[PDB]
Amino acid sequence: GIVEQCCASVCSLYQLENYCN
Amino acid sequence: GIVEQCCASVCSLYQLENYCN
Amino acid sequence: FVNQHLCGSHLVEALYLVCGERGFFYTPK
Amino acid sequence: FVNQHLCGSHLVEALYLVCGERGFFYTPK
């Protein structure tokens, strides 16, 4: 999930926008 | 929505928890 | 901290603190 | 601000800034 991809590893805009409504 | 109930008016714990997963 | 007007980052912060490891959804419009 | 490690309130903050008036969901577990 988001923690694994953006906290435990380096985040990205491409991944963050996947969590926008 | 949440803005109307917690920004435009005074928030509450009862309302905030309605937005928890 | 919750029983006040909460807007923008202030509201997102309150949700984060209250909801803890459940997480939350923020749907302003 | 997005291309780094982001945890807890830092992550919620990034989502808030990136997603704007769409809002977002934060589902840590």
Numbering used by the authors:
A (entry chain A), B (entry chain A): 1 to 21
C (entry chain B), D (entry chain B): 1 to 29
Give the published text.
The structure contains 51 amino acids in two chains connected by three disulfide bonds. Bovine insulin (Sigma; catalogue No. I5500) was dissolved in 0.02 M Na2HPO4 and 0.01 M Na3EDTA to a final concentration of 30 mg ml−1. Crystals were grown by the hanging-drop vapour-diffusion method at 20°C by equilibration against a reservoir consisting of 0.2 M Na2HPO4/Na3PO4 pH 10.0, 0.01 M Na EDTA. Cubic crystals grew in about 1 h, and most of the crystals were interpenetrant owing to the high concentration of protein (which was deliberate in order to encourage the growth of twinned crystals) [Fig. 11(a), right]. Cubic insulin crystallizes in space group I213, which belongs to the lower symmetry cubic Laue group. In our case, CELL_NOW indexed the two domains using alternative settings. The resulting detwinned data set extends to a maximum resolution of 1.55 Å. Using these data, SHELXD found the positions of three disulfide bridges. Density modification and autotracing modules in a beta version of SHELXE could trace two chains.
